[PDB]
Amino acid sequence: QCVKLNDGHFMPVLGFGTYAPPEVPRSKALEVTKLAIEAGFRHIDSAHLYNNEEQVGLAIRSKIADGSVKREDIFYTSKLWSTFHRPELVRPALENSLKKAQLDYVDLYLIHSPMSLKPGEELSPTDENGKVIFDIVDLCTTWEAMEKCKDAGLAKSIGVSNFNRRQLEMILNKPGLKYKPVCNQVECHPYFNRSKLLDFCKSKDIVLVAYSALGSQRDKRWVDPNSPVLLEDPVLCALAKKHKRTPALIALRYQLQRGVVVLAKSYNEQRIRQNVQVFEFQLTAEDMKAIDGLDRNLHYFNSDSFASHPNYPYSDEY
Ligand SMILES: NC(=O)c1ccc[n+]([C@@H]2O[C@H](COP(=O)([O-])OP(=O)(O)OC[C@H]3O[C@@H](n4cnc5c(N)ncnc54)[C@H](OP(=O)(O)O)[C@@H]3O)[C@@H](O)[C@H]2O)c1
């Protein structure tokens, strides 16, 4: 139930999403990450931005101590936040994430976004006029610093997130490149299926990792409340009744059968355990084509605050 990455490491194809909005007590991340491991998740996706690495790491430590899993059974991902793109800041950011999680290494470290931000303590630096303070960083130099983190064993694998094809190409074409990104973690669901980006990643042996694969948490601060609700889609719901599954399980299985590694966030014990049932059934080829037809080029995360960023990834076709 893993895919082999282009550096030889293995990534479980179903991953547990750990992000919850700040209104959710931090203790919940601890509790639900334990439930996810108990349910059978082995890939756990976190990030400096999520303000939960300490709790996610404590969950992993607890399930190692009670004998459920060994460290080597768990695939843990963290992400370099955009205020840390300048190369001298990369390794200290990873070391801080490892200290918080009380891990010796991450299995995967990602550049969280190509949209570099002003360095400093604030995660969302804002100027006097309320505008996001962007930074300008040659992301190939960020990548070179990521490579030294893998050389040092702090990250078993390195990859990117929210890159478009042109941004990936800049890394792949970098002189003296030592390590390809093993993955590109991007928004991917039936309303935004990234088929062209997927085909490019496949042609380069880069894994596409899907986030918001169940339609996002629809946080009113970042997602239009009027956007359609993915799991209410009539085609997904009819396929769910056909297969005696659920719309969420159809959406997750869709990604698995097109070669995409899929994340699924749930803080609900019953839904966490349901999501591992993605391995219990298959969609037909005709089912897959029906889901392919749902694409609406719908990005659930769509704030104008970032559309002006010079590295905004959605100004390109793919
Ligand atoms: N790299 C990035 O920029 C980026 C961006 C966004 C997300 N991500 C990663 O991907 C993860 C997942 O994406 P996401 O947080 O947007 O959420 P998601 O996986 O799309 O899930 C959306 C909602 O679906 C619900 N859900 C889960 N299982 C369900 C089921 N079986 N039936 C019905 N509803 C179900 C969850 O609610 P309940 O909790 O109530 O079950 C959840 O709030 C994040 O947690 C993060 O780890 C990365």
Ligand SMILES: Cc1cc(Br)ccc1NC(=O)CN(C)Cc1cc(=O)oc2c(C)c(O)ccc12
């Ligand atoms: C991710 C992204 C990609 C592109 Br391209 C353009 C914009 C965005 N972000 C937003 O629009 C909202 N951002 C600022 C916060 C945010 C809210 C949240 O609920 O979850 C997040 C998760 C799970 C992340 O990993 C990163 C950020 C968030």
